[PDB]
């Protein structure tokens, strides 16, 4: 009783739904080998193979199977099927850096959705187009390239359209994703205030769902945007909130990054004592996760903070640690600067005594 295409297919489907796409792929592959005349099911097989490989990060294969799905959906005249495949093929092409074709695929998805009067599908396409342009914008390279700017502005436009429709459909969670990406795009463009405004909404919505991760993301984005608005005190308030959330979600890495941002922010506010505190908390966690590179960044920062406080002795110590870490990780610029900091501090000390 050799298994039928449909049976293998259903196994691959539940396998992928359980997180094990590596196995599901196997069954889907087998089902294709067995074959079927039900092209609608074969279409679903390809689509799921493409999506599974995408998840496995085998984009070349995700491309192959989404390409197949799109072709078949078109051959058998499945409109909704073509729209979905166009969107999937577009996200894949995006990852692969083929933005021109990704845009075409996602625009195709948009068109078919509007024709079928598929409002949620329309929303999904606008969001995909927004994501594609966002990626395009980041795929370039003190002049800000106009090509980066046009792409990012294109993203803002699609995100706003998606946002508009998605709030009209009452999809609160989708509004949240729209706000967050809209905020990050503005951040990269340099529209800090609008970034802040969009992120506040992302924060607002994350709280409604009790989505702690989303909430943490919003606090970090807010802090970063305020830094570039020159509003450091406001930035610190948000970095503290990310720290608490991070501390609460038991994320050591993120908690360390938060302490490091706080150290820098307080240095900008010229409160070196607090900078020291936060940089120390970051130092510890860095050592704990055995992150030498970040430990170097820590010693570098501590040395500067202590130097700014007049604490010569403590500055020496960290400059030494910095020089050490820098050489161990093979960082040239750091080695030299740590070196220059050491000899300078030694000069400051030795010259502080009469001839």
């Amino acid at each position: 009783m050799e298994a039928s295409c449909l049976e293998l297919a259903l196994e691959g489907e539940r396998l992928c739904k359980s997180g094990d796409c590596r196995a599901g792929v196997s069954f889907f592959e087998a089902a294709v080998q067995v074959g079927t005349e039900d092209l609608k099911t074969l279409s679903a097989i390809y689509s799921q193979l493409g999506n599974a490989y995408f998840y496995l990060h085998d984009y070349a294969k995700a491309l192959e199977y989404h390409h197949h799905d799109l072709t078949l959906a078109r051959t058998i005249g499945d409109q909704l099927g073509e729209a979905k495949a166009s969107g999937n093929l577009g996200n894949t092409l995006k990852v692969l850096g083929n933005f021109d074709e990704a845009i075409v695929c996602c625009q195709r998805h948009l068109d078919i959705s509007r024709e079928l009067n598929d409002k949620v599908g329309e929303a999904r396409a606008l969001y995909n187009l927004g994501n594609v342009y966002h990626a395009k914008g980041k795929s370039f390279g003190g002049e800000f390239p106009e090509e980066v700017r046009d792409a990012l502005q294109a993203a803002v436009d699609f995100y706003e359209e998606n946002l508009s429709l998605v709030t009209a459909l009452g999809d609160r969670a989708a509004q949240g994703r729209a706000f967050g990406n809209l905020g990050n795009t503005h951040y990269l463009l340099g529209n800090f205030r609008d970034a802040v405004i969009a992120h506040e909404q992302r924060l607002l919505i994350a709280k409604e769902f009790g989505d702690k991760a989303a909430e943490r993301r919003a606090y970090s984005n807010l802090g970063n945007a305020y830094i570039f608005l020159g509003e450091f005190e406001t930035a610190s308030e948000y970095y503290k909130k990310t720290l608490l959330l991070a501390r609460q979600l038991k994320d050591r890495a993120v908690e360390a990054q938060s302490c490091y941002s706080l150290g820098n922010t307080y240095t900008l506010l010229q409160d070196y004592e607090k900078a020291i505190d936060y940089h120390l908390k970051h130092l510890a966690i860095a050592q704990e996760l055995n992150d030498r590179i970040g430990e170097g960044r820590a010693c570098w920062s501590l040395g500067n903070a202590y130097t700014a406080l007049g604490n010569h002795d403590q500055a020496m110590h960290f400059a030494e640690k910095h020089l050490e870490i820098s050489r161990e990780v093979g960082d040239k610029s750091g080695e030299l600067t740590a070196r220059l900091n050491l000899s300078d501090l030694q000069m400051v000390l030795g010259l502080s005594y009469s001839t």
Partner: protein, 45 residues
């Protein structure tokens, strides 16, 4: 002492905590209403 803070801002300038950037749609095989969901919020590279 701005060198270390300068390097921090330079990185921060490119840092974003994005939402899902890879929304995939599924074509279910199982006819069961137990899983008629077609949204896959995958995380790109």
């Amino acid at each position: 002492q701005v060198d270390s803070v300068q390097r921090w801002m330079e990185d921060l300038k490119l840092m974003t905590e994005c939402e899902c950037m890879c929304v995939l749609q599924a074509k279910p095989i199982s006819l069961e209403e137990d899983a008629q969901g077609d949204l896959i919020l995958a995380g790109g590279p």
